[PDB]
Every structure is written in structure tokens, then in C-alpha cells.
Amino acid sequence: APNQALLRILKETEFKKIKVLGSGAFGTVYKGLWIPEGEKVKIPVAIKEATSPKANKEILDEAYVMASVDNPHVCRLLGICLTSTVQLITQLMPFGCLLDYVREHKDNIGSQYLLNWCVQIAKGMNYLEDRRLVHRDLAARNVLVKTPQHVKITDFGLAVPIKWMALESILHRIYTHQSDVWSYGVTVWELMTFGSKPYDGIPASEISSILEKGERLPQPPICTIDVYMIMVKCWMIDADSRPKFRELIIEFSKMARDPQRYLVIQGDERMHLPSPTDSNFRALMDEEDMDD
């Protein structure tokens, strides 16, 4: 099954860095726009610049993975730039990572959005399953927010988050798709608790025997036993007894019809989050998921 992904090399005269969005280990990442020349099109992008000409290797590997996927709930690569420090041009996710998003707005997300995020993340995970790719670091941090109604997974297939890993990944370093549903169970617990740290007071070493013997995360207050039951089903030690992503899409999109039936958030009906208005820094030709 040939890979056949298309790796686009981009001209840096085609994109402009607007503001810095981060800096540190991996490198400085910029919010910017890409103008495919002769196309009369401006694309809001994120440009990940390598820390130094030595840290390139980590970038080109990331470019290999991102180019090899295509799903509405997986992050999209547009191209790379082979400068002195190579540049990684990815779709701009203006609202950041879902972890920071649920913490900042905790008092304005209703049940419709929580359950819709679970079904969307499960969709992307089901896609990475169909492609036989294992994420190995599924967390609330590695889920980026395009709009409050559209989220996409990121940082897939590249490699310690001990509190997110399944037991076979702990003791035996075994990473499969059923080890990913365990991480999926933790992230749902992350969202249902509005960005809480799993096993807050516990050190990393004690976790293995805590799970091996039989303890798990507690029940989120807003969570009914229905949504909490599938969270614990994700945390079985027997990977084959854990549910499948295909089933998690089904179960969640079901609760996504009567959301007040499965998540008790006081004031749920009064809550809401913004819509994609024409906010920018001028820009009358903007797109992103519509450029093909």
C-alpha cells in the first residue's frame, strides 16, 4: 500500500509571520498567513521554526507523519520551507489546545459541546486506526481547536506522560490502538473535569501498582453513570475488553442528541461560546480547509 503522500515545499516569500505564539524546546511557532502565489488566496497558517539547524531532524519527521494523513479531525500539513532552519507550515488553530480552552472558559461550555468533542476526537482516532497509525500521546493538550465546534488531533505518531498511558504501555512498553483508547479515556476525564490534572497528588512511580491492582480516576461531578461507565471501560487492563473507537463514536453521538440527559451542568441552557466572525488584523481573501 504505497504511501504516495505529497510533500509540498513552500516559498517563504509566499508566507508572512505575524506574531509569535510560543517558544522553547521544539522551537518558536508563529501565527501567520500563506499566500499561494498566483492563486489570489491568503491562508491563515502556523509556522513552526526549528530551534537551530540541528533540531531540523525532528521537524522533517513531523512533516513525514502530518503529510501522510487526511481527515477532518486530524491536523493538516500544508507544506514545509527549507530555510537555514526549516519551517513547518500547519493549519492555524486560533483557539489553542483544548486543555487550555476548557480551563479558561469552564463556566461557558455546555453538554452539547463536551459530547460533540468526544465524538469528534473519537472520529479522528478511528481514522488513525484505519491508517494503522498509533498516536502514543493522546492527551487534552494534543487536541487543537479550530472553532469551538471543530477540534482536531495533533502530535501523532512521533515519540513521559505516565498518567495517560495504559498499563501494558507502562510495564511492557506496549503501544497499540487499544492502548490509545485508554489515553482517550483519560482525556475525556480531562474534559469532563474542566481541565483537571489526573492523579493530582500521586507520584509517577506508584501508578503502576495502583492500576494493576485496580484503582482508577474518580467520577466527575457533572458526569452521569452512563458517560462514566464508558470511561472505566476504556481503562480495562485487558486491551480486547476495552471499547473500540468505532463504538465510542456511536455511543457518544447518541448522548450528543439528548446532552442534558447525560451531563449535568448547572445553567447548561444559558451557556454558549463564540462563532467565527470576521476577526483579523485588511484580509478579504481568507480560507484554510477549503484550499485543495
Name the structure determination technique.
X-ray
CB 202 within 8 A of CB 215: no
C-alpha to C-alpha distance for 164 and 266, rounded to whole angstroms? 29
Cell for 6? 505529497
Does residue 29 have a known ligand-binding role?
A: yes
Which residues have a catalytic role annotated? 137
CB 159 within 8 A of CB 136: yes
Does residue 28 have a known ligand-binding role?
A: yes
Domain segments of the chain as ranges: 15-91, 96-270
Resolution (A): 3.0
C-alpha to C-alpha distance for 23 and 16, rounded to whole angstroms? 18
Kindly list the distances between the CA atom of residue 54 and the CA atoms of 8, 29, 41, 82, 173, in Å, as whole numbers in the listed order: 22, 17, 33, 13, 29
What letter does residue 38 receive in the DSSP assignment?
A: T
What letter does residue 194 receive in the DSSP assignment?
A: T
CB atoms within 10 A of CB 54: 9
Return the beta strands (E) in the chain as ranges: 15-22, 29-34, 43-49, 77-81, 87-91, 143-147, 150-153
Does residue 193 have a known ligand-binding role?
A: no
Does residue 147 have a known ligand-binding role?
A: no
CB 148 within 8 A of CB 271: no
C-alpha to C-alpha distance for 204 and 226, rounded to whole angstroms? 29
C-alpha to C-alpha distance for 206 and 178, rounded to whole angstroms? 23
First-residue to last-residue Cα distance in the chain: 23
Does residue 187 have a known ligand-binding role?
A: no
Q: Which residues does residue 97 pair with via DSSP β-bridges, in sequence order?
A: 144
Does residue 277 have a known ligand-binding role?
A: no
C-alpha to C-alpha distance for 210 and 207, rounded to whole angstroms? 5
C-alpha to C-alpha distance for 59 and 55, rounded to whole angstroms? 7
Sign (positive or negative) of CA dihedral 47, 135, 225, 214: negative
Q: Which residues does residue 48 pair with via DSSP β-bridges, in sequence order?
A: 29, 88
Closest by alpha carbon to 275, among 113, 154, 71?
113
Q: C-alpha 80: how far from its chain's center?
A: 21
Cell for 15? 508566507
Cell for 64? 513525514
Domain 96-270 sits in CATH at 1.10.510.10
Which CATH homologous superfamily contains domain 15-91?
Phosphorylase Kinase; domain 1 (3.30.200.20)
Instruction: Give residues with Cβ within 8 angstroms of 1, minimum separation 6.
Output: none
Residue 268's identity, in one-letter code, is D
DSSP reduced 3-state for 177: helix
